[PDB]
Scaffold this active site. Structure first.
Site, PDB file in Angstrom:
ATOM      1  N   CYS A  74     -16.963 -51.779 -16.554  1.00 10.70           N
ATOM      2  CA  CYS A  74     -18.118 -51.448 -15.746  1.00 10.70           C
ATOM      3  C   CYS A  74     -19.302 -52.332 -16.038  1.00 10.70           C
ATOM      4  O   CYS A  74     -19.846 -52.299 -17.180  1.00 10.70           O
ATOM      5  CB  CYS A  74     -18.537 -49.980 -15.958  1.00 10.70           C
TER       6      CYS A  74
ATOM      7  N   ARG B 287     -23.221 -50.539 -16.854  1.00  9.17           N
ATOM      8  CA  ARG B 287     -23.468 -49.601 -17.927  1.00  9.17           C
ATOM      9  C   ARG B 287     -24.908 -49.599 -18.489  1.00  9.17           C
ATOM     10  O   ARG B 287     -25.190 -48.781 -19.369  1.00  9.17           O
ATOM     11  CB  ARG B 287     -22.477 -49.820 -19.060  1.00  9.17           C
TER      12      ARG B 287
ATOM     13  N   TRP C  18     -23.973 -46.408  -7.604  1.00  5.60           N
ATOM     14  CA  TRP C  18     -24.279 -47.173  -6.390  1.00  5.60           C
ATOM     15  C   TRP C  18     -23.616 -48.560  -6.393  1.00  5.60           C
ATOM     16  O   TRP C  18     -23.122 -49.028  -7.420  1.00  5.60           O
ATOM     17  CB  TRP C  18     -25.780 -47.346  -6.251  1.00  5.60           C
TER      18      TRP C  18
ATOM     19  N   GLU D  48     -18.794 -55.656  -4.076  1.00  7.71           N
ATOM     20  CA  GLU D  48     -17.669 -54.701  -4.003  1.00  7.71           C
ATOM     21  C   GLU D  48     -17.309 -54.417  -2.551  1.00  7.71           C
ATOM     22  O   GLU D  48     -16.140 -54.202  -2.216  1.00  7.71           O
ATOM     23  CB  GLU D  48     -17.953 -53.382  -4.715  1.00  7.71           C
TER      24      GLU D  48
HETATM   25  C1  HEM Z   1     -24.992 -47.344 -11.392  1.00  4.14           C
HETATM   26  C2  HEM Z   1     -24.251 -48.085 -10.584  1.00  4.14           C
HETATM   27  C3  HEM Z   1     -22.914 -48.702 -11.047  1.00  4.14           C
HETATM   28  C4  HEM Z   1     -22.548 -49.951 -10.821  1.00  4.14           C
HETATM   29  C5  HEM Z   1     -23.396 -50.989 -10.053  1.00  4.14           C
HETATM   30  C6  HEM Z   1     -21.232 -50.132 -11.380  1.00  4.14           C
HETATM   31  C7  HEM Z   1     -20.497 -51.289 -11.377  1.00  4.14           C
HETATM   32  C8  HEM Z   1     -19.127 -51.357 -11.431  1.00  4.14           C
HETATM   33  C9  HEM Z   1     -18.277 -52.359 -10.829  1.00  4.14           C
HETATM   34  C10 HEM Z   1     -18.767 -53.543  -9.965  1.00  4.14           C
HETATM   35  C11 HEM Z   1     -17.020 -52.075 -11.159  1.00  4.14           C
HETATM   36  C12 HEM Z   1     -15.746 -52.854 -10.739  1.00  4.14           C
HETATM   37  C13 HEM Z   1     -15.067 -52.110  -9.603  1.00  4.14           C
HETATM   38  C14 HEM Z   1     -13.926 -52.935  -9.109  1.00  4.14           C
HETATM   39  O1  HEM Z   1     -14.176 -54.180  -9.046  1.00  4.14           O
HETATM   40  O2  HEM Z   1     -12.817 -52.339  -8.802  1.00  4.14           O
HETATM   41  C15 HEM Z   1     -17.041 -50.880 -11.975  1.00  4.14           C
HETATM   42  C16 HEM Z   1     -15.985 -50.247 -12.563  1.00  4.14           C
HETATM   43  C17 HEM Z   1     -16.089 -49.060 -13.267  1.00  4.14           C
HETATM   44  N1  HEM Z   1     -17.212 -48.267 -13.514  1.00  4.14           N
HETATM   45 FE1  HEM Z   1     -19.078 -48.666 -12.859  1.00  4.14          FE
HETATM   46  N2  HEM Z   1     -20.875 -48.971 -12.037  1.00  4.14           N
HETATM   47  C18 HEM Z   1     -21.869 -48.042 -11.775  1.00  4.14           C
HETATM   48  C19 HEM Z   1     -21.889 -46.720 -12.191  1.00  4.14           C
HETATM   49  C20 HEM Z   1     -20.875 -46.096 -12.883  1.00  4.14           C
HETATM   50  C21 HEM Z   1     -20.823 -44.714 -13.303  1.00  4.14           C
HETATM   51  C22 HEM Z   1     -21.887 -43.612 -12.996  1.00  4.14           C
HETATM   52  C23 HEM Z   1     -19.669 -44.574 -13.974  1.00  4.14           C
HETATM   53  C24 HEM Z   1     -19.129 -43.295 -14.619  1.00  4.14           C
HETATM   54  C25 HEM Z   1     -20.013 -42.516 -15.205  1.00  4.14           C
HETATM   55  C26 HEM Z   1     -18.959 -45.827 -14.007  1.00  4.14           C
HETATM   56  C27 HEM Z   1     -17.738 -46.092 -14.603  1.00  4.14           C
HETATM   57  C28 HEM Z   1     -16.869 -47.109 -14.236  1.00  4.14           C
HETATM   58  C29 HEM Z   1     -15.466 -47.194 -14.580  1.00  4.14           C
HETATM   59  C30 HEM Z   1     -14.568 -46.262 -15.432  1.00  4.14           C
HETATM   60  C31 HEM Z   1     -14.983 -48.487 -13.951  1.00  4.14           C
HETATM   61  C32 HEM Z   1     -13.544 -49.063 -14.009  1.00  4.14           C
HETATM   62  C33 HEM Z   1     -12.789 -48.293 -12.956  1.00  4.14           C
HETATM   63  C34 HEM Z   1     -11.385 -48.820 -12.873  1.00  4.14           C
HETATM   64  O3  HEM Z   1     -10.741 -49.081 -13.941  1.00  4.14           O
HETATM   65  O4  HEM Z   1     -10.957 -48.986 -11.706  1.00  4.14           O
HETATM   66  N3  HEM Z   1     -19.748 -46.741 -13.363  1.00  4.14           N
HETATM   67  N4  HEM Z   1     -18.343 -50.507 -12.184  1.00  4.14           N
HETATM   68  C1  LIG Z   2     -19.341 -45.168  -9.977  1.00  6.49           C
HETATM   69  C2  LIG Z   2     -18.925 -46.522  -9.464  1.00  6.49           C
HETATM   70  C3  LIG Z   2     -19.820 -47.401  -8.893  1.00  6.49           C
HETATM   71  C4  LIG Z   2     -19.375 -48.635  -8.424  1.00  6.49           C
HETATM   72  N1  LIG Z   2     -20.258 -49.496  -7.884  1.00  6.49           N
HETATM   73  N2  LIG Z   2     -18.062 -48.978  -8.481  1.00  6.49           N
HETATM   74  C5  LIG Z   2     -17.158 -48.116  -9.052  1.00  6.49           C
HETATM   75  C6  LIG Z   2     -15.669 -48.408  -9.152  1.00  6.49           C
HETATM   76  C7  LIG Z   2     -15.144 -49.076  -7.884  1.00  6.49           C
HETATM   77  C8  LIG Z   2     -15.591 -48.546  -6.535  1.00  6.49           C
HETATM   78  N3  LIG Z   2     -14.785 -49.440  -5.699  1.00  6.49           N
HETATM   79  C9  LIG Z   2     -13.493 -49.734  -6.282  1.00  6.49           C
HETATM   80  C10 LIG Z   2     -13.629 -49.202  -7.718  1.00  6.49           C
HETATM   81  O1  LIG Z   2     -12.946 -47.965  -7.895  1.00  6.49           O
HETATM   82  C11 LIG Z   2     -11.746 -48.132  -8.665  1.00  6.49           C
HETATM   83  C12 LIG Z   2     -10.626 -48.712  -7.784  1.00  6.49           C
HETATM   84  C13 LIG Z   2      -9.225 -48.468  -8.343  1.00  6.49           C
HETATM   85  C14 LIG Z   2      -8.669 -49.693  -9.076  1.00  6.49           C
HETATM   86  C15 LIG Z   2      -7.582 -49.314 -10.091  1.00  6.49           C
HETATM   87  C16 LIG Z   2      -6.232 -49.039  -9.442  1.00  6.49           C
HETATM   88  C17 LIG Z   2      -5.289 -48.203 -10.071  1.00  6.49           C
HETATM   89  C18 LIG Z   2      -4.050 -47.950  -9.460  1.00  6.49           C
HETATM   90  C19 LIG Z   2      -3.750 -48.539  -8.219  1.00  6.49           C
HETATM   91  C20 LIG Z   2      -4.691 -49.379  -7.585  1.00  6.49           C
HETATM   92  F1  LIG Z   2      -4.445 -49.964  -6.387  1.00  6.49           F
HETATM   93  C21 LIG Z   2      -5.921 -49.621  -8.207  1.00  6.49           C
HETATM   94  C22 LIG Z   2     -17.585 -46.883  -9.533  1.00  6.49           C
END
Ligand code: HEM
Ligand SMILES: Cc1cc(N)nc(C[C@@H]2CNC[C@@H]2OCCCCCc2cccc(F)c2)c1
Ligand code: HEM
Ligand SMILES: Cc1cc(N)nc(C[C@@H]2CNC[C@@H]2OCCCCCc2cccc(F)c2)c1
Ligand SMILES: C[C@H](O)[C@H](O)[C@H]1CNc2nc(N)[nH]c(=O)c2N1
Ligand SMILES: C[C@H](O)[C@H](O)[C@H]1CNc2nc(N)[nH]c(=O)c2N1
Ligand SMILES: [Zn+2]
Lengths: 407, 411
Positions: free
Chosen positions: A106, A109, A278, A283
């Protein structure tokens, strides 16, 4: 044992010790790096509980106190009797914020400590879960001044009494396989868009149909609900200089809200914990629109710009990509929905690493995910060495439920 | 054992068994990934095993594993190691070796070309003047009037490590950087420290924006010596844009031949500390990195100013927009002048096809994702969606400390 990370654009070196606390295993061995793979008893529970509460009482500067020791015994006894335990609200809030703080993938963070936590452990039904979710969505949306939030349903017990939000995100567009062979809407959602239709959803069959929530409470069969349309903020997509952009008929939703992950706090497993923040502009513009197996609109856009598409070396794909992303940002800004651009977002993350290195001795980070999917080398995260390691509390992937829940 | 990699765009799944032949360590453990870290006198004992592994491999490639000619060569190397401490590669093993080091280069997107490599054997060289002449020839053969050909020149192996052949330049052809008293920099900022060494050693810096550095060449552990590459040997391209006529007036140009001179080639235990190699550029190495890093030419501002982009807020994406036009200009200029270049779309596509064919014939392809994915437009190139497995094979290219930090000066 104490490891360095160098930024090759600033020569700033930071030393990491936080990785020594690391607990779980990465997938890598010193023979093979797995850094670019997407997915690489009562006996166990007490150690896990103790490690968590230890860091908790440390965080509020009460390590070694009466309160700490007492709590440790309280939990120890509760596991002994019940085979599980319950978190204080204060511990729940800390746990959830820290799972975010520890998400190495993320980029956002720097905001970790402003997470509104909604305790929904008193939930018992899909209707209950629906009401919780609409309140989350409405609170989070905030008419466009978006606010980070998580909602936590009850923890796993025997694993056949799981709470699960089946959707991957709370808000997503429908994807429909056509006689044509091609795909209308969002192709990443085709399967699910048909698990819904298969359970009764009246599909409008449009480009941008907002999917129904499909909620599973207490391990029961799941049920459909339409999120009130007035709770789903959407942004019409226009370009600040290209008049014809409007006519592509593009919209996106304002609320990214991941709903298929599993939250672990101190050994406890919260399998329904939809959370939301947000968007970073890329994305939507890079991945949602331009990705091959997503909306894939580059060709149609390049044309309207009348670019030379006869050869890859004209960089027309690149040209169009920039414009699409300019237009996502412009649209969100003009409709007053929070959104961050990748320059701004990677720049804050650098700042957040600096802070975490000095406040905590490190910050786990997955370079492959932190660097934006466009213009990598011009964002400062490109030139930043990062160390990746798994800390707890955490969010983890979990099997899609339709593969598990015995219907 | 067997390991699977998935392409998430095509759903194609591949199975790697080749990673079982990895014995060198990655830097990672089961507790930490060091996959984004830039950098994660040998004795008899360890030498015959490395020699043996290398020669079992070489002889398998030619379908003569187990042959008398294989056994005799093991005996021969055995005997030569214990009476001389080292051994010499035959021509055929040197060539096979140099090719394989490229082929095993997990950071190289260009490897589809691995078997087309011109190997120049400079193991009879003894002096720096001798090095200069060998390097000139290579530069002329590789340039080939714009129609670039891959080539490597290999100078004598390390002996006691007190007698090293080194090319002190990091690349055969590069521009000087000059730090000014006011704090600014002329030319290439990456090249300042090195330019300083050259100047100190006798070089008359013209002090311009694109001064081709002199070669600084170490033979046999001796002090290194300055040489100038004949300018007529140095193919350069003036940079212009097909639509933006103010672009030429920016005054930019680049050299056509990318040629890494500072790496160490390991073959069968032997260390070739001077082994300059060269290929041809992917446009983004110049357009994104060389021009647009803040620590390099940093012309983003100047290009965005001329384009009349809104530069007040980063969410105008002025930077992203400028970056693309510069890259347009780079491929345009090269192609106009008939100098081999590849764009990142074509280069990543070819590599995916190379990678798959490598899993089919070889059982694997080590690849570093951080390095293979281009530094602009990552996700619209097919490598972004390709899972990769990184591990170390020999033969291999390795980084080596700059010789100015280690070298014992003589006078
Ligand atoms: C405040 C705005 C936030 C932004 C701009 C942001 C940004 C991002 C971005 C750009 C990704 C990559 C998504 C992708 O490319 O598939 C991501 C992944 C992730 N974020 Fe954030 N984040 C935000 C808030 C949060 C919050 C509130 C949480 C949980 C409390 C969080 C937890 C995660 C997790 C666990 C991932 C990895 C998800 C995965 O493995 O697919 N984020 N974040
Ligand atoms: C809270 C938050 C904010 C933000 N800007 N982005 C995120 C996470 C982002 C939102 N768009 C895509 C991503 O969500 C996770 C997508 C799932 C990828 C992992 C995965 C696992 C199994 C099969 C798949 F096809 C993909 C989360
Ligand atoms: C055919 C033309 C070639 C192309 C288009 C190409 C492409 C590339 C590119 C873009 C990089 C990354 C450079 C960077 O990001 O700094 C690279 C790295 C590398 N390539 Fe190539 N390559 C080519 C030929 C060769 C040859 C002939 C060799 C040796 C025989 C070679 C071996 C390597 C090695 C060892 C690296 C990693 C360099 C490092 O770790 O600093 N490549 N390749
Ligand atoms: C033969 C060849 C062709 C081609 N298109 N590209 C290359 C490699 C590129 C060409 N320009 C320089 C680059 O290699 C070195 C540049 C950056 C490496 C920096 C660096 C620092 C520490 C450890 C390393 F392994 C590398 C080599
Ligand atoms: C193969 C590779 O692990 C995979 O495509 C990753 C690459 N980087 C990514 N980065 C982000 N931010 N999101 C992703 O979904 C991916 N996909
Ligand atoms: C910190 C990081 O690993 C480092 O800056 C790498 C990232 N990826 C790269 N990729 C390529 N092709 N070339 C590079 O110089 C780098 N730099
Ligand atoms: Zn790793």
């Amino acid at each position: 044992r104490f490891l360095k990370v160098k930024n090759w654009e600033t020569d700033v070196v930071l030393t990491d010790t936080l990785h020594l606390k690391s607990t779980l295993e990465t997938g890598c061995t010193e023979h093979i790096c797995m850094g670019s793979i997407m997915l690489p008893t009562k006996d166990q529970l007490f150690p896990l509980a103790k490690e968590f509460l230890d860091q908790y009482y440390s965080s509020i500067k009460r390590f070694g106190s009466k309160a700490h020791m007492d709590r440790l015994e309280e939990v120890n006894k509760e596991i002994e009797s019940t085979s599980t335990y319950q978190l204080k609200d204060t511990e729940l809030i800390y746990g959830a914020k820290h799972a975010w703080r520890n998400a190495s993938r993320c980029v956002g963070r720097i905001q970790w400590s402003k997470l509104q936590v909604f305790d929904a452990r008193d939930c018992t039904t899909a209707h209950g879960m629906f009401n919780y979710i609409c309140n989350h969505v409405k609170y989070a949306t905030n008419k466009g001044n978006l606010r980070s939030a998580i909602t936590i349903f009850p923890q796993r017990t025997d694993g056949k009494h799981d709470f699960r939000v089946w959707n991957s995100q709370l808000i997503r567009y429908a994807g429909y396989k056509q006689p044509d062979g091609s795909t209308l809407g969002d192709p990443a959602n085709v399967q699910f868009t048909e698990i819904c239709i298969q359970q009764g959803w009246k599909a409008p069959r449009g480009r941008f149909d907002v999917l129904p929530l499909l909620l599973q409470a207490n391990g029961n069969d799941p049920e459909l609900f339409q999120i009130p349309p007035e709770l789903v903020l959407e942004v019409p997509i226009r370009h600040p200089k290209f008049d014809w952009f409007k006519d592509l008929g593009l919209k996106w939703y304002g609320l990214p809200a991941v709903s298929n992950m599993l939250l672990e706090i101190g050994g406890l497993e919260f399998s329904a914990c939809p959370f939301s923040g947000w968007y970073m502009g890329t994305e939507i513009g890079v991945r949602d629109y331009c990705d091959n197996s997503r909306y894939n609109i580059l060709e149609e856009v390049a044309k309207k710009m009348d670019l030379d598409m006869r050869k890859t070396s004209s960089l027309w794909k690149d040209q169009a990509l920039v414009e699409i992303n300019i237009a996502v940002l412009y649209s969100f800004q003009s409709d007053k929905v929070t959104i961050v651009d990748h320059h701004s977002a990677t720049e804050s993350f650098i700042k957040h690493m600096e802070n975490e290195y000095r406040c905590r001795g490190g910050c786990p980070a997955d370079w492959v995910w932190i660097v934006p999917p466009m213009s990598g080398s011009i964002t400062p995260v490109f030139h930043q060495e990062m160390l990746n390691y798994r800390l707890t509390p955490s969010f983890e992937y979990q099997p899609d439920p339709w593969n598990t829940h015995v219907w």
